[PDB]
PDB file of C-alpha atoms in Angstrom:
ATOM      1  CA  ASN A  10      -9.756 -24.619  -3.374  1.00  0.00           C
ATOM      2  CA  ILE A  11     -10.533 -26.171   0.075  1.00  0.00           C
ATOM      3  CA  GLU A  12      -7.764 -27.016   2.610  1.00  0.00           C
ATOM      4  CA  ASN A  13      -8.444 -29.251   5.671  1.00  0.00           C
ATOM      5  CA  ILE A  14      -6.807 -27.590   8.738  1.00  0.00           C
ATOM      6  CA  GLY A  15      -7.708 -30.252  11.229  1.00  0.00           C
ATOM      7  CA  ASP A  16     -10.609 -31.688  13.150  1.00  0.00           C
ATOM      8  CA  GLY A  17     -13.894 -30.131  11.979  1.00  0.00           C
ATOM      9  CA  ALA A  18     -12.242 -27.167  10.225  1.00  0.00           C
ATOM     10  CA  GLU A  19     -11.219 -26.161   6.715  1.00  0.00           C
ATOM     11  CA  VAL A  20     -10.234 -23.106   4.758  1.00  0.00           C
ATOM     12  CA  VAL A  21     -12.043 -22.086   1.548  1.00  0.00           C
ATOM     13  CA  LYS A  22      -9.732 -20.053  -0.681  1.00  0.00           C
ATOM     14  CA  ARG A  23     -10.911 -17.480  -3.245  1.00  0.00           C
ATOM     15  CA  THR A  24      -9.081 -14.817  -5.297  1.00  0.00           C
ATOM     16  CA  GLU A  25     -10.151 -11.539  -6.980  1.00  0.00           C
ATOM     17  CA  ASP A  26      -7.994  -9.489  -9.365  1.00  0.00           C
ATOM     18  CA  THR A  27      -8.762  -5.990 -10.665  1.00  0.00           C
ATOM     19  CA  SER A  28      -6.561  -3.451 -12.453  1.00  0.00           C
ATOM     20  CA  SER A  29      -7.032   0.248 -13.250  1.00  0.00           C
ATOM     21  CA  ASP A  30      -5.180   2.196 -15.991  1.00  0.00           C
ATOM     22  CA  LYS A  31      -6.673   5.421 -14.525  1.00  0.00           C
ATOM     23  CA  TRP A  32      -4.906   4.917 -11.165  1.00  0.00           C
ATOM     24  CA  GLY A  33      -2.023   2.623 -12.162  1.00  0.00           C
ATOM     25  CA  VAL A  34      -3.139  -0.102  -9.748  1.00  0.00           C
ATOM     26  CA  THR A  35      -3.578  -3.879  -9.588  1.00  0.00           C
ATOM     27  CA  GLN A  36      -5.391  -5.282  -6.525  1.00  0.00           C
ATOM     28  CA  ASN A  37      -4.791  -9.048  -6.067  1.00  0.00           C
ATOM     29  CA  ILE A  38      -6.977 -10.028  -3.103  1.00  0.00           C
ATOM     30  CA  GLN A  39      -6.968 -13.435  -1.412  1.00  0.00           C
ATOM     31  CA  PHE A  40     -10.161 -14.296   0.578  1.00  0.00           C
ATOM     32  CA  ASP A  41      -9.586 -17.216   2.931  1.00  0.00           C
ATOM     33  CA  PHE A  42     -12.840 -18.276   4.665  1.00  0.00           C
ATOM     34  CA  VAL A  43     -12.074 -20.157   7.895  1.00  0.00           C
ATOM     35  CA  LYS A  44     -14.869 -22.720   8.446  1.00  0.00           C
ATOM     36  CA  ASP A  45     -14.420 -24.050  12.086  1.00  0.00           C
ATOM     37  CA  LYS A  46     -17.045 -25.837  14.245  1.00  0.00           C
ATOM     38  CA  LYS A  47     -15.144 -24.878  17.452  1.00  0.00           C
ATOM     39  CA  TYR A  48     -15.342 -21.143  16.641  1.00  0.00           C
ATOM     40  CA  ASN A  49     -18.605 -19.241  17.310  1.00  0.00           C
ATOM     41  CA  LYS A  50     -17.976 -16.840  14.380  1.00  0.00           C
ATOM     42  CA  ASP A  51     -17.540 -16.857  10.571  1.00  0.00           C
ATOM     43  CA  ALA A  52     -13.973 -15.650   9.872  1.00  0.00           C
ATOM     44  CA  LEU A  53     -12.272 -14.218   6.744  1.00  0.00           C
ATOM     45  CA  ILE A  54      -8.572 -13.690   6.110  1.00  0.00           C
ATOM     46  CA  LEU A  55      -7.812 -11.023   3.525  1.00  0.00           C
ATOM     47  CA  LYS A  56      -4.395 -10.922   1.973  1.00  0.00           C
ATOM     48  CA  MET A  57      -4.109  -7.711   0.029  1.00  0.00           C
ATOM     49  CA  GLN A  58      -1.472  -7.805  -2.669  1.00  0.00           C
ATOM     50  CA  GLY A  59      -0.802  -6.436  -6.147  1.00  0.00           C
ATOM     51  CA  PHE A  60       0.891  -3.319  -7.447  1.00  0.00           C
ATOM     52  CA  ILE A  61       0.677   0.442  -7.035  1.00  0.00           C
ATOM     53  CA  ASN A  62       2.654   2.255  -9.823  1.00  0.00           C
ATOM     54  CA  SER A  63       4.812   5.068  -8.394  1.00  0.00           C
ATOM     55  CA  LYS A  64       3.648   7.269 -11.361  1.00  0.00           C
ATOM     56  CA  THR A  65       6.933   9.217 -10.936  1.00  0.00           C
ATOM     57  CA  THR A  66       7.135  11.830 -13.733  1.00  0.00           C
ATOM     58  CA  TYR A  67       9.730  14.464 -14.682  1.00  0.00           C
ATOM     59  CA  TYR A  68       8.612  17.583 -16.583  1.00  0.00           C
ATOM     60  CA  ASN A  69       9.713  21.151 -17.199  1.00  0.00           C
ATOM     61  CA  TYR A  70       8.444  23.829 -14.875  1.00  0.00           C
ATOM     62  CA  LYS A  71       6.296  25.915 -17.137  1.00  0.00           C
ATOM     63  CA  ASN A  72       8.073  27.891 -19.924  1.00  0.00           C
ATOM     64  CA  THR A  73      11.430  28.093 -18.051  1.00  0.00           C
ATOM     65  CA  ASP A  74      14.743  26.449 -19.119  1.00  0.00           C
ATOM     66  CA  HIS A  75      16.143  26.239 -15.540  1.00  0.00           C
ATOM     67  CA  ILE A  76      13.293  24.988 -13.255  1.00  0.00           C
ATOM     68  CA  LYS A  77      12.415  21.339 -13.748  1.00  0.00           C
ATOM     69  CA  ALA A  78      10.099  19.074 -11.767  1.00  0.00           C
ATOM     70  CA  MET A  79       9.770  15.607 -10.246  1.00  0.00           C
ATOM     71  CA  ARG A  80       6.313  14.399  -9.145  1.00  0.00           C
ATOM     72  CA  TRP A  81       6.822  11.348  -6.894  1.00  0.00           C
ATOM     73  CA  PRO A  82       5.007   9.259  -4.223  1.00  0.00           C
ATOM     74  CA  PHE A  83       5.663  10.551  -0.719  1.00  0.00           C
ATOM     75  CA  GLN A  84       3.344   7.860   0.670  1.00  0.00           C
ATOM     76  CA  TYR A  85       1.491   4.690  -0.355  1.00  0.00           C
ATOM     77  CA  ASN A  86      -2.075   4.189   0.919  1.00  0.00           C
ATOM     78  CA  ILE A  87      -3.550   0.832   1.811  1.00  0.00           C
ATOM     79  CA  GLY A  88      -7.007   0.756   3.371  1.00  0.00           C
ATOM     80  CA  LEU A  89      -9.760  -1.745   4.168  1.00  0.00           C
ATOM     81  CA  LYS A  90     -13.325  -1.074   5.433  1.00  0.00           C
ATOM     82  CA  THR A  91     -16.691  -2.800   5.902  1.00  0.00           C
ATOM     83  CA  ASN A  92     -20.168  -1.259   6.427  1.00  0.00           C
ATOM     84  CA  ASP A  93     -21.565  -4.511   7.846  1.00  0.00           C
ATOM     85  CA  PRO A  94     -22.546  -4.099  11.536  1.00  0.00           C
ATOM     86  CA  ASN A  95     -22.101  -7.889  11.952  1.00  0.00           C
ATOM     87  CA  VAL A  96     -18.464  -7.812  10.744  1.00  0.00           C
ATOM     88  CA  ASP A  97     -15.541  -6.901  13.079  1.00  0.00           C
ATOM     89  CA  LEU A  98     -11.963  -6.374  11.989  1.00  0.00           C
ATOM     90  CA  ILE A  99     -10.134  -8.545  14.554  1.00  0.00           C
ATOM     91  CA  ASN A 100      -6.494  -8.383  13.396  1.00  0.00           C
ATOM     92  CA  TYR A 101      -4.233  -6.897  10.757  1.00  0.00           C
ATOM     93  CA  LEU A 102      -0.581  -7.132   9.790  1.00  0.00           C
ATOM     94  CA  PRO A 103       1.705  -5.136   9.958  1.00  0.00           C
ATOM     95  CA  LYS A 104       0.358  -4.022  13.354  1.00  0.00           C
ATOM     96  CA  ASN A 105       3.121  -1.582  14.435  1.00  0.00           C
ATOM     97  CA  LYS A 106       5.378   1.156  13.006  1.00  0.00           C
ATOM     98  CA  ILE A 107       8.051  -0.707  11.021  1.00  0.00           C
ATOM     99  CA  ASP A 108      11.060   0.863   9.226  1.00  0.00           C
ATOM    100  CA  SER A 109      12.933  -2.308   8.165  1.00  0.00           C
ATOM    101  CA  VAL A 110      13.729  -2.593   4.400  1.00  0.00           C
ATOM    102  CA  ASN A 111      11.736  -5.857   4.250  1.00  0.00           C
ATOM    103  CA  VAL A 112       8.459  -6.319   6.083  1.00  0.00           C
ATOM    104  CA  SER A 113       7.872 -10.136   6.545  1.00  0.00           C
ATOM    105  CA  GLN A 114       5.278 -11.267   9.122  1.00  0.00           C
ATOM    106  CA  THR A 115       3.039 -14.332   9.682  1.00  0.00           C
ATOM    107  CA  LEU A 116      -0.564 -14.650  10.874  1.00  0.00           C
ATOM    108  CA  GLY A 117      -1.342 -18.022  12.487  1.00  0.00           C
ATOM    109  CA  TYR A 118      -4.776 -19.561  13.117  1.00  0.00           C
ATOM    110  CA  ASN A 119      -5.608 -22.367  15.613  1.00  0.00           C
ATOM    111  CA  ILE A 120      -8.918 -24.336  15.894  1.00  0.00           C
ATOM    112  CA  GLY A 121     -11.146 -22.433  18.341  1.00  0.00           C
ATOM    113  CA  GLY A 122     -10.802 -18.946  16.834  1.00  0.00           C
ATOM    114  CA  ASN A 123      -7.279 -18.348  18.126  1.00  0.00           C
ATOM    115  CA  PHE A 124      -5.288 -15.924  15.945  1.00  0.00           C
ATOM    116  CA  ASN A 125      -1.552 -15.193  16.611  1.00  0.00           C
ATOM    117  CA  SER A 126       0.601 -12.556  14.921  1.00  0.00           C
ATOM    118  CA  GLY A 127       3.595 -14.893  15.292  1.00  0.00           C
ATOM    119  CA  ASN A 133       4.834 -21.205  11.889  1.00  0.00           C
ATOM    120  CA  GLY A 134       4.283 -25.029  12.420  1.00  0.00           C
ATOM    121  CA  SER A 135       2.465 -24.726  15.796  1.00  0.00           C
ATOM    122  CA  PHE A 136      -0.634 -23.451  13.852  1.00  0.00           C
ATOM    123  CA  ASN A 137      -3.493 -25.204  12.017  1.00  0.00           C
ATOM    124  CA  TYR A 138      -3.359 -22.470   9.297  1.00  0.00           C
ATOM    125  CA  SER A 139      -1.100 -19.499   8.397  1.00  0.00           C
ATOM    126  CA  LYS A 140      -0.713 -16.578   5.967  1.00  0.00           C
ATOM    127  CA  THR A 141       2.491 -14.622   5.488  1.00  0.00           C
ATOM    128  CA  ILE A 142       2.978 -11.046   4.257  1.00  0.00           C
ATOM    129  CA  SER A 143       6.220  -9.931   2.554  1.00  0.00           C
ATOM    130  CA  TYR A 144       7.101  -6.606   1.028  1.00  0.00           C
ATOM    131  CA  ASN A 145      10.073  -4.307   0.480  1.00  0.00           C
ATOM    132  CA  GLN A 146       9.859  -0.615   1.484  1.00  0.00           C
ATOM    133  CA  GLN A 147      13.535   0.581   1.122  1.00  0.00           C
ATOM    134  CA  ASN A 148      13.845   4.183   2.562  1.00  0.00           C
ATOM    135  CA  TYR A 149      10.103   4.116   3.560  1.00  0.00           C
ATOM    136  CA  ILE A 150       8.373   3.427   6.927  1.00  0.00           C
ATOM    137  CA  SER A 151       5.040   1.636   7.436  1.00  0.00           C
ATOM    138  CA  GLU A 152       2.490   2.720  10.006  1.00  0.00           C
ATOM    139  CA  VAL A 153      -1.213   2.419  10.881  1.00  0.00           C
ATOM    140  CA  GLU A 154      -2.830   5.822  10.146  1.00  0.00           C
ATOM    141  CA  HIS A 155      -6.274   4.803  11.420  1.00  0.00           C
ATOM    142  CA  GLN A 156      -8.104   1.724  12.832  1.00  0.00           C
ATOM    143  CA  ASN A 157     -11.457   0.659  14.339  1.00  0.00           C
ATOM    144  CA  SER A 158     -13.760  -2.387  14.276  1.00  0.00           C
ATOM    145  CA  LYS A 159     -14.814  -1.584  10.697  1.00  0.00           C
ATOM    146  CA  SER A 160     -11.512  -0.335   9.181  1.00  0.00           C
ATOM    147  CA  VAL A 161      -7.695  -0.278   8.988  1.00  0.00           C
ATOM    148  CA  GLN A 162      -5.529   2.229   7.004  1.00  0.00           C
ATOM    149  CA  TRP A 163      -1.754   2.064   6.440  1.00  0.00           C
ATOM    150  CA  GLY A 164       0.646   4.780   5.285  1.00  0.00           C
ATOM    151  CA  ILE A 165       3.999   3.674   3.722  1.00  0.00           C
ATOM    152  CA  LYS A 166       5.910   7.022   3.596  1.00  0.00           C
ATOM    153  CA  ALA A 167       9.306   8.486   2.524  1.00  0.00           C
ATOM    154  CA  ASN A 168      11.462   8.240   5.643  1.00  0.00           C
ATOM    155  CA  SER A 169      15.315   8.094   5.633  1.00  0.00           C
ATOM    156  CA  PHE A 170      17.623   8.252   2.656  1.00  0.00           C
ATOM    157  CA  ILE A 171      21.441   8.116   2.102  1.00  0.00           C
ATOM    158  CA  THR A 172      22.271  10.888  -0.415  1.00  0.00           C
ATOM    159  CA  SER A 173      25.544  12.435  -1.803  1.00  0.00           C
ATOM    160  CA  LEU A 174      25.059  15.146   0.944  1.00  0.00           C
ATOM    161  CA  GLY A 175      24.678  12.476   3.679  1.00  0.00           C
ATOM    162  CA  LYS A 176      21.513  11.238   5.450  1.00  0.00           C
ATOM    163  CA  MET A 177      18.207  12.941   4.471  1.00  0.00           C
ATOM    164  CA  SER A 178      14.663  12.764   5.811  1.00  0.00           C
ATOM    165  CA  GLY A 179      11.641  12.254   3.488  1.00  0.00           C
ATOM    166  CA  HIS A 180      10.835  15.950   4.110  1.00  0.00           C
ATOM    167  CA  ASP A 181      14.241  17.391   3.002  1.00  0.00           C
ATOM    168  CA  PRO A 182      13.581  19.789   0.037  1.00  0.00           C
ATOM    169  CA  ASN A 183      16.918  18.777  -1.548  1.00  0.00           C
ATOM    170  CA  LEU A 184      15.914  15.075  -1.637  1.00  0.00           C
ATOM    171  CA  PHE A 185      16.407  13.514  -5.166  1.00  0.00           C
ATOM    172  CA  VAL A 186      18.070  16.728  -6.610  1.00  0.00           C
ATOM    173  CA  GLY A 187      20.458  15.854  -9.483  1.00  0.00           C
ATOM    174  CA  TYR A 188      23.873  16.756 -10.871  1.00  0.00           C
ATOM    175  CA  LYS A 189      23.285  18.201 -14.375  1.00  0.00           C
ATOM    176  CA  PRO A 190      22.195  21.917 -14.021  1.00  0.00           C
ATOM    177  CA  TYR A 191      22.808  22.564 -17.723  1.00  0.00           C
ATOM    178  CA  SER A 192      20.781  19.721 -19.181  1.00  0.00           C
ATOM    179  CA  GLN A 193      17.460  20.487 -20.853  1.00  0.00           C
ATOM    180  CA  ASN A 194      16.118  17.072 -19.868  1.00  0.00           C
ATOM    181  CA  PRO A 195      13.913  17.288 -16.728  1.00  0.00           C
ATOM    182  CA  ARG A 196      15.096  13.732 -15.769  1.00  0.00           C
ATOM    183  CA  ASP A 197      18.704  15.004 -15.566  1.00  0.00           C
ATOM    184  CA  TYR A 198      17.789  17.530 -12.786  1.00  0.00           C
ATOM    185  CA  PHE A 199      17.174  14.530 -10.460  1.00  0.00           C
ATOM    186  CA  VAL A 200      19.281  11.560  -9.233  1.00  0.00           C
ATOM    187  CA  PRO A 201      19.450   8.509 -11.621  1.00  0.00           C
ATOM    188  CA  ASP A 202      17.269   5.388 -11.101  1.00  0.00           C
ATOM    189  CA  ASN A 203      20.181   3.411  -9.544  1.00  0.00           C
ATOM    190  CA  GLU A 204      20.192   6.055  -6.707  1.00  0.00           C
ATOM    191  CA  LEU A 205      16.373   5.940  -6.303  1.00  0.00           C
ATOM    192  CA  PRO A 206      14.573   3.373  -4.153  1.00  0.00           C
ATOM    193  CA  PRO A 207      12.207   0.919  -5.952  1.00  0.00           C
ATOM    194  CA  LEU A 208       9.242   2.734  -4.271  1.00  0.00           C
ATOM    195  CA  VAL A 209      10.131   5.879  -6.291  1.00  0.00           C
ATOM    196  CA  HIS A 210      11.371   4.539  -9.690  1.00  0.00           C
ATOM    197  CA  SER A 211       8.860   1.677 -10.059  1.00  0.00           C
ATOM    198  CA  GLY A 212       6.149   1.405  -7.417  1.00  0.00           C
ATOM    199  CA  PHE A 213       4.883  -0.523  -4.372  1.00  0.00           C
ATOM    200  CA  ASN A 214       4.090  -4.232  -4.115  1.00  0.00           C
ATOM    201  CA  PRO A 215       1.681  -4.350  -1.118  1.00  0.00           C
ATOM    202  CA  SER A 216       1.436  -7.410   1.139  1.00  0.00           C
ATOM    203  CA  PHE A 217      -1.048  -6.723   3.961  1.00  0.00           C
ATOM    204  CA  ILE A 218      -3.305  -8.922   6.075  1.00  0.00           C
ATOM    205  CA  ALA A 219      -6.698  -8.249   7.713  1.00  0.00           C
ATOM    206  CA  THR A 220      -8.835 -10.786   9.513  1.00  0.00           C
ATOM    207  CA  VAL A 221     -12.565 -10.049   9.775  1.00  0.00           C
ATOM    208  CA  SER A 222     -15.106 -11.951  11.942  1.00  0.00           C
ATOM    209  CA  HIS A 223     -18.784 -12.238  11.114  1.00  0.00           C
ATOM    210  CA  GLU A 224     -21.631 -13.212  13.447  1.00  0.00           C
ATOM    211  CA  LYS A 225     -22.856 -16.740  12.516  1.00  0.00           C
ATOM    212  CA  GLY A 226     -26.241 -16.521  10.778  1.00  0.00           C
ATOM    213  CA  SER A 227     -26.690 -12.725  10.950  1.00  0.00           C
ATOM    214  CA  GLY A 228     -26.632 -12.256   7.162  1.00  0.00           C
ATOM    215  CA  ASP A 229     -25.298 -14.148   4.130  1.00  0.00           C
ATOM    216  CA  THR A 230     -23.340 -11.216   2.640  1.00  0.00           C
ATOM    217  CA  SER A 231     -20.812  -8.489   3.577  1.00  0.00           C
ATOM    218  CA  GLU A 232     -19.250  -5.633   1.589  1.00  0.00           C
ATOM    219  CA  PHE A 233     -15.538  -4.686   1.874  1.00  0.00           C
ATOM    220  CA  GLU A 234     -13.880  -1.639   0.333  1.00  0.00           C
ATOM    221  CA  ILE A 235     -10.159  -1.952  -0.452  1.00  0.00           C
ATOM    222  CA  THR A 236      -8.196   1.216  -1.336  1.00  0.00           C
ATOM    223  CA  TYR A 237      -4.712   1.272  -2.911  1.00  0.00           C
ATOM    224  CA  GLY A 238      -3.081   4.530  -3.819  1.00  0.00           C
ATOM    225  CA  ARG A 239      -0.466   7.216  -3.271  1.00  0.00           C
ATOM    226  CA  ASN A 240      -0.007  10.841  -2.125  1.00  0.00           C
ATOM    227  CA  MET A 241       2.339  12.686  -4.465  1.00  0.00           C
ATOM    228  CA  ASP A 242       4.934  15.311  -3.641  1.00  0.00           C
ATOM    229  CA  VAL A 243       6.517  17.649  -6.221  1.00  0.00           C
ATOM    230  CA  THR A 244      10.209  18.578  -6.042  1.00  0.00           C
ATOM    231  CA  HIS A 245      11.278  21.592  -8.113  1.00  0.00           C
ATOM    232  CA  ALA A 246      15.021  21.646  -8.973  1.00  0.00           C
ATOM    233  CA  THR A 247      16.222  25.192  -9.853  1.00  0.00           C
ATOM    234  CA  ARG A 248      19.598  25.980 -11.431  1.00  0.00           C
ATOM    235  CA  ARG A 249      21.745  28.224  -9.222  1.00  0.00           C
ATOM    236  CA  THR A 250      24.844  30.331 -10.143  1.00  0.00           C
ATOM    237  CA  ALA A 253      33.773  30.684  -7.629  1.00  0.00           C
ATOM    238  CA  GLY A 254      31.527  30.718 -10.763  1.00  0.00           C
ATOM    239  CA  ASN A 255      30.076  27.104 -10.838  1.00  0.00           C
ATOM    240  CA  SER A 256      26.386  26.025 -11.248  1.00  0.00           C
ATOM    241  CA  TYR A 257      24.354  23.569  -9.124  1.00  0.00           C
ATOM    242  CA  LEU A 258      20.705  22.524  -8.523  1.00  0.00           C
ATOM    243  CA  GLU A 259      18.504  23.360  -5.568  1.00  0.00           C
ATOM    244  CA  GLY A 260      15.312  21.702  -4.484  1.00  0.00           C
ATOM    245  CA  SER A 261      12.060  23.132  -3.128  1.00  0.00           C
ATOM    246  CA  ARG A 262       9.026  21.048  -2.235  1.00  0.00           C
ATOM    247  CA  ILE A 263       5.215  21.110  -2.607  1.00  0.00           C
ATOM    248  CA  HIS A 264       4.452  18.449   0.106  1.00  0.00           C
ATOM    249  CA  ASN A 265       1.123  16.555  -0.440  1.00  0.00           C
ATOM    250  CA  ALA A 266       0.632  18.259  -3.833  1.00  0.00           C
ATOM    251  CA  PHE A 267      -1.709  15.329  -4.888  1.00  0.00           C
ATOM    252  CA  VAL A 268      -3.307  13.392  -2.020  1.00  0.00           C
ATOM    253  CA  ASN A 269      -5.424  10.192  -2.146  1.00  0.00           C
ATOM    254  CA  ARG A 270      -4.750   9.291  -5.768  1.00  0.00           C
ATOM    255  CA  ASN A 271      -6.479   5.991  -4.920  1.00  0.00           C
ATOM    256  CA  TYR A 272      -8.139   3.056  -6.651  1.00  0.00           C
ATOM    257  CA  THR A 273     -11.032   1.756  -4.476  1.00  0.00           C
ATOM    258  CA  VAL A 274     -12.763  -1.575  -5.107  1.00  0.00           C
ATOM    259  CA  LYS A 275     -15.945  -2.755  -3.386  1.00  0.00           C
ATOM    260  CA  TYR A 276     -16.077  -6.562  -2.898  1.00  0.00           C
ATOM    261  CA  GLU A 277     -19.073  -8.629  -1.856  1.00  0.00           C
ATOM    262  CA  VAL A 278     -18.477 -11.846   0.102  1.00  0.00           C
ATOM    263  CA  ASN A 279     -21.092 -14.611   0.627  1.00  0.00           C
ATOM    264  CA  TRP A 280     -20.529 -16.377   3.944  1.00  0.00           C
ATOM    265  CA  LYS A 281     -22.679 -19.440   3.016  1.00  0.00           C
ATOM    266  CA  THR A 282     -21.544 -20.023  -0.624  1.00  0.00           C
ATOM    267  CA  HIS A 283     -17.956 -18.571  -0.327  1.00  0.00           C
ATOM    268  CA  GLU A 284     -18.468 -16.668  -3.592  1.00  0.00           C
ATOM    269  CA  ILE A 285     -16.830 -13.272  -4.288  1.00  0.00           C
ATOM    270  CA  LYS A 286     -18.247 -10.458  -6.429  1.00  0.00           C
ATOM    271  CA  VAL A 287     -16.696  -7.076  -7.399  1.00  0.00           C
ATOM    272  CA  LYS A 288     -19.732  -4.742  -6.686  1.00  0.00           C
ATOM    273  CA  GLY A 289     -18.040  -1.634  -8.055  1.00  0.00           C
ATOM    274  CA  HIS A 290     -14.875   0.480  -8.268  1.00  0.00           C
ATOM    275  CA  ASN A 291     -13.665   4.019  -9.030  1.00  0.00           C
TER     276      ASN A 291
END
């Protein structure tokens, strides 16, 4: 679909969808080519959406009756890179450390290659919107060829008051005598959506390409998680309770990576490969 955005400019919209049962990921990518006569560069707006399954599991610790485990996502990973020397990452959203429950931001474009991370005054716009209850979003790394976000366990309200994402007693349950590993941890109504279900990413990246320097560019988009393990141990003025201990970053970069090829002249998208 083509959208006129004013005098001598239009936007060509394309979409690519890929899922992985191996990683528990759906990448829904929107590629919006900005074709403007008044802008000396080819420009692409990437809206990265979809789903990253939390893959939260509860299992018994070995051959014990009293140590049970919760493997859960400490952090979600969102990354974008290019290997094209003619392509520059010019902007991305969210840009700064944000801890609000809902992250809702707008990228605005104006004829002449003017991008603003602030609608109606613009010729074109794209909006990101995602929930990250109890998590914080931040840029882990960035350069002219890449941007990487971390959406990590941050602040939680528990039965023992406020807890950090690093507290070993985080998510520890109320049933020390149950044989069900799920019972050793707080119920789903006490867990944030990012733990019980997964993450619905909504991220933006704008890339610029030098006019007539090459018809194609490759982009690698990575969606994943880093898993923590919480062990809940039964402890025994004769009552029993549960105590947590943590293996932080027990499983890092459990990521689904997809390589996309973009054609700047034809506006066609191809999935080159994936893991």
